[PDB]
Design a protein around this ligand. Structure first.
Ligand SMILES: Nc1ncnc2c1ncn2[C@@H]1O[C@H](COP(=O)(O)OP(=O)(O)OP(O)(O)=S)[C@@H](O)[C@H]1O
Ligand SMILES: Nc1ncnc2c1ncn2[C@@H]1O[C@H](COP(=O)(O)OP(=O)(O)OP(O)(O)=S)[C@@H](O)[C@H]1O
Ligand SMILES: Nc1ncnc2c1ncn2[C@@H]1O[C@H](COP(=O)(O)OP(=O)(O)OP(O)(O)=S)[C@@H](O)[C@H]1O
Ligand SMILES: Nc1ncnc2c1ncn2[C@@H]1O[C@H](COP(=O)(O)OP(=O)(O)OP(O)(O)=S)[C@@H](O)[C@H]1O
Lengths: 689, 264, 167, 66
């Protein structure tokens, strides 16, 4: 029979029970069945963005036929998976693909209208046999579908429906659309509540329902790449994989095994002893931990085997519902269900007793591990070091930023709300405006914020507004439309954030540009969405937008004295009302103002430069001290409020680095020597003692 | 032959324009992010015409169309938001002359996607000076007439022939903002109950927020970031201590000059 | 027997010690083993510039299988590698690439969930003539294949972001 | 016979790109993909010869043939 030569009975595989039970979806499956039982055009197609279960819709159709929940006109149908990979196979001689295909056509005409044809990737069938002057399946299924003796069922991606089948208009209107909807968050919750037991049959572990609903919430908010419910499925499966490999690993056994091999190497090097006894104790401890590991593995193995027998009992009582055996129903129910449920719960609480070293159930912490590793959103529940680190955010800033406490407190509040998770799900996390004089650590503040969040200085998409002094530069940074040159690339900032989802964006020197470069900024601070040239959105909600300008800096240095903070912000906010548009300054979280530095802070900054200098030269490998009189004279020589801190920086740079590296490569400065940075009469000297 | 309704909203910012449109979408589909939002402030040059309607034959991204005619060929009953349209390059609107004359649209590949079941909404924010100047002691009608003349200064006379009704907004009063604060505290209770903390508030603290976030000149967002700072920062502060036991009634009660939480 | 015609038993080679005792990279090997014991989407890809030894990473995985350092889904499997250029280069006519491709899938189902597949040049498999990804679409989707990728980041962003089933 | 000598015979075949990308056969193979096992079988210490361009066409693109 030529039917099995190229097709696959899905109802065979439904009887196999290998398939996903499909939950929800009364509406589209009723709609598809209505399009199946017509007079002409027995041709539904499934259309929607990928992952949404279009294959599973037809699979759930087959399950409801075998279970018999259909109208009577389908009771007896045969859904078949036609295969392009079967049909294209060896058609190297002329008229070979067409021969196979028309054999299929006439043998389904033999079937007396009791067979439903299923094809995935219907566009592939459209371009299947389309050779240069040949015949495809498109112009061969043109006749058997306008009459519709061939009960086709389609499946496609939305874009490639548009490119591929809508090119061919006749085989476009052979088929009725069914616009498969993006499933909702709560429908996704329900589906995940149904798909749990198949996954636990796979990964030999257990799943907790708050982790399920948290998987739905997190996957819906933070990813933007794939679509529901598929990304939630992948989170769940990936966490279950990590837990299974934690089970068959352990880390204390790793430490004990590295310990016993270290003590074994030490004992063999010594061959006073005591280390035979210590090695025996550590190997006995390792053996006990290993035996506990094996006992946990045996316990979870037996629990999973009896859970698998429970699921086979569920499948068997459904086979008894379809077939209709009498004693099998009450027998399987009243015997197999309650005793296996109670001893499966007994095995579960036995696991909760015996699991000491490892973990067994899927918790939301595991899910958030997978999500944070998977893209980069810092989701997970806080461990102690990171949380108390966040509580001492201000301290860590003043480990690197002395002075300007306002912005420290501001950004500390921002990121505490961020990792707290109280942010607005329609606005980005940080949205700030920095106004201070030239050279007061604003850029280094943001760099330190990046180094807090990321342990990285410039993993931040600094996009300097100084370049952008005419109107085109929006189309530099967001892209250029189709037709023009920069469509093939995509924009800069939009690919920066689509690459790194969780970043810190700087718009430095934001006094320079024309006042309508601030409209992308309006859309960013409106929803956190931005549409680049190609026409898709990019999520900015998990980012931080930062501007550093120097507008009222003259008024800052004029009147930071004899004023409080409130009148300061009021007057300089009016100054921005002179400059920018008021439609913009509503959007900003806090506009902190930067006072000029004081000499104590300048000395502290010099200390910081000495600390990073000692750091870099101890990386070079030098033991360097200082006469603090040199610090005092460098402080006295590099004071100017009108120019900020960087004059001290270049004074340090010149009057330190020049004699230093002047005498390093001379062989005068030997590593390991005490290098006391003493003074000359007007300069600095270093000694080798 | 015309699309369902084509409105030009006006006002100063932060009074609820975008929220009216998102309220429509979250009504009509129960979703804010199921609509069409063309951020028209990008369109400061005359090219993004050829990002929304598509690029003609013989050019780069030809077989993927615009952004507009794609997703309105898809979903024929959407509600477009074109926000901030006053900052477009002032002739991008001629595209919108077709869009609001008949709501067919000559795209790239030629197929006339049809709009006539899709609400065009335009929301500008031209009404700063005029509404802040004379919303007091004036009716709705003369305000509509005078800011209509203002938009006639800005746009083309060709254009506001088309627009169905140009409804014009008003700045907020204090009790309005108190109700706004009620809504914001509802969404805060939403975001924190998902985390799992039963939180109440002093009703006096509502009045303190009314003393806090009020200014007539900036709309409702000053209330929002006042809520942000003067509620969330002590809140997320004390949460991150491990201090707040879940299940306790966390009543946001006033300080002398601030608002504090309880654990009882 | 197209396995004799197109694949290489690397487990045989390292079993005979032919291969590099590859050192390090254990975190990435472990994440690959995580991926290779899922229920669905059972296919890792390897993103890196050529010459960083992604081949050798799969080789060291195979040596660990020879060692038997694996969890309880991989003990007894046979890792076999495959090119696409060995399949594309014999396309005189319509349907000659694809007979080879389906006979490959027949051998894969024939070994009954015991063979782990390797394929490098994933971005090659995008273009052969529809041609290649759609025939592998069911076995990549239904767990009946354990494909392992190897390509470069530029070719990932150029090719593999196009077909979502390829993603 | 190469397996009989085990690297004793050091063959030469020039135009490797020609032997890879032109040996078309009907229901039959080439020398390229039948000796691509001998690449990863060590029984092939063979030498080639080509031009600067066709090496880059038909040789540098494959991994094993690299
Ligand atoms: N409601 C549902 N019931 C059962 N399984 C579902 C449901 N929604 C999604 N799935 C599963 O999620 C996965 C993704 O659905 P698929 O049908 O494979 O995507 P698709 O419909 O094939 O679209 P593409 O383009 O092939 S990704 C499958 O394993 C489905 O079984
Ligand atoms: N409190 C501080 N702690 C540490 N370094 C500081 C502090 N205040 C200023 N600085 C230093 O001041 C230097 C100059 O500040 P920058 O941020 O680099 O310049 P700026 O503040 O951005 O102003 P412009 O417009 O860029 S000149 C930096 O190298 C900082 O290290
Ligand atoms: N009447 C209102 N009801 C509820 N929320 C409001 C109201 N007015 C303002 N808001 C809130 O404050 C934000 C500002 O409203 P928007 O309409 O976005 O600003 P706008 O008035 O549209 O000016 P644009 O669009 O930003 S130029 C909204 O997103 C809501 O969060
Ligand atoms: N962990 C490792 N230990 C030892 N050598 C390694 C390791 N990782 C990679 N290498 C070396 O990297 C070399 C690169 O060879 P290949 O495997 O061909 O390169 P690749 O990284 O696989 O990329 P291509 O596409 O194959 S060139 C190998 O010969 C290895 O010896």
């Amino acid at each position: 029979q030529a039917l099995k030569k190229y097709t696959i009975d899905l109802t065979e595989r439904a009887e196999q029970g290998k398939l996903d039970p499909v939950i929800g979806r009364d509406e589209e499956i009723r709609r598809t069945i209505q399009v199946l039982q017509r007079r002409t055009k027995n041709n539904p197609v499934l259309i929607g963005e990928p992952g949404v279960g279009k294959t599973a819709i037809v699979e759930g159709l087959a399950q409801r036929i075998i279970n018999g929940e259909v109208p009577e006109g389908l009771k007896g149908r045969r859904v078949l998976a036609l295969d392009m990979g079967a049909l294209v196979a060896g058609a190297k001689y002329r008229g070979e693909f067409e021969e196979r295909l028309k054999g299929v056509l006439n043998d389904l005409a033999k079937q007396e209208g009791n067979v439903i044809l299923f094809i995935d990737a219907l566009h592939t069938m459209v371009g299947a046999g389309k050779a240069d002057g040949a015949m495809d399946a498109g112009n061969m299924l043109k006749p058997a579908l306008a009459r519709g003796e061939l009960h086709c069922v389609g499946a496609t991606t939305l874009d490639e429906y548009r490119q591929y089948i809508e090119k061919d208009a006749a085989l476009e209107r052979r088929f009725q659309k069914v616009f498969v909807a993006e499933p909702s968050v709560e429908d996704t919750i329900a589906i995940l509540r149904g798909l749990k037991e198949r996954y636990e049959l796979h990964h030999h572990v257990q799943i907790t329902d708050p982790a399920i609903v948290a998987a739905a919430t997190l996957s819906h908010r933070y990813i933007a790449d794939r679509q529901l419910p598929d990304k939630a499925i992948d989170l769940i499966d990936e966490a279950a994989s990590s837990i299974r490999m934690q089970i068959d690993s352990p880390e204390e056994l790793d430490r004990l095994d590295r310990r016993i091999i270290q003590l074994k190497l030490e004992q063999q090097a010594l061959m006073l002893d005591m280390l035979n006894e210590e090695l025996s104790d550590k190997e006995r401890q390792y053996s006990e931990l290993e035996e506990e590991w094996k006992a946990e593995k045996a316990s979870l193995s037996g629990t999973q085997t009896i859970k698998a027998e429970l699921e086979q009992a569920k499948i068997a009582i459904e086979q008894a519902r379809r077939v209709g055996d009498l004693a099998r129903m009450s027998e399987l129910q009243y015997g197999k269900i309650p005793e296996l449920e109670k001893q499966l719960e007994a095995a579960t609480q036995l696991e909760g007793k015996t699991m000491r070293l490892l973990r067994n159930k899927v918790t939301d912490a595991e899910i958030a591990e997978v999500l944070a590793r998977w893209t980069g959103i810092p989701v997970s529940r806080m461990m102690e070091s990171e949380r108390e680190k966040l509580l001492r955010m201000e301290q860590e800033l003043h480990h690197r930023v002395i002075g300007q406490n306002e912005a420290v407190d501001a950004v500390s509040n921002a990121i505490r709300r961020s990792r707290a998770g109280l942010a607005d799900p329609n606005r980005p996390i940080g949205s700030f405006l920095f106004l201070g004089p030239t050279g007061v650590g604003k850029t280094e503040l943001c760099k330190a914020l990046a180094n807090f969040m990321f342990d990285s200085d410039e993993a931040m998409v600094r996009i300097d507004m100084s370049e952008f002094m005419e109107k085109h530069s929006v189309s530099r940074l967001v892209g250029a439309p189709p037709g023009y040159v920069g469509y093939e690339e995509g924009g800069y900032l939009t690919e920066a954030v689509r690459r790194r989802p969780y970043s810190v964006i700087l718009l430095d020197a934001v006094e320079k540009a024309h006042p309508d470069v601030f409209n992308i900024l309006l859309q960013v601070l409106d929803d956190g969405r931005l549409t680049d040239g190609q026409g898709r959105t990019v999520d900015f909600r998990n980012t931080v937008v930062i501007m550093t300008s120097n507008l009222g800096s003259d008024l800052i240095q004029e009147r930071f004295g004899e004023l409080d903070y409130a009148h300061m912000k009021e007057l300089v906010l009016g100054v921005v009302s002179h400059n920018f548009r008021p439609e913009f300054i509503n959007r900003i979280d806090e506009v902190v103002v930067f006072h000029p530095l004081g000499e104590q802070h300048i000395a502290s900054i010099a200390q910081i430069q000495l600390k990073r200098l000692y750091k870099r030269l101890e990386e070079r490998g030098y033991e360097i001290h200082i006469s603090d009189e040199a610090l005092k004279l460098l402080s006295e020589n590099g004071y100017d409020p009108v120019y900020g801190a960087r004059p001290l920086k270049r004074a340090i740079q010149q009057q330190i680095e020049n004699p230093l590296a002047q005498q390093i490569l001379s062989g005068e400065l030997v590593p390991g020597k005490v290098i006391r940075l003493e003074v000359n009469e007007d300069r600095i000297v270093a000694v080798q003692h």
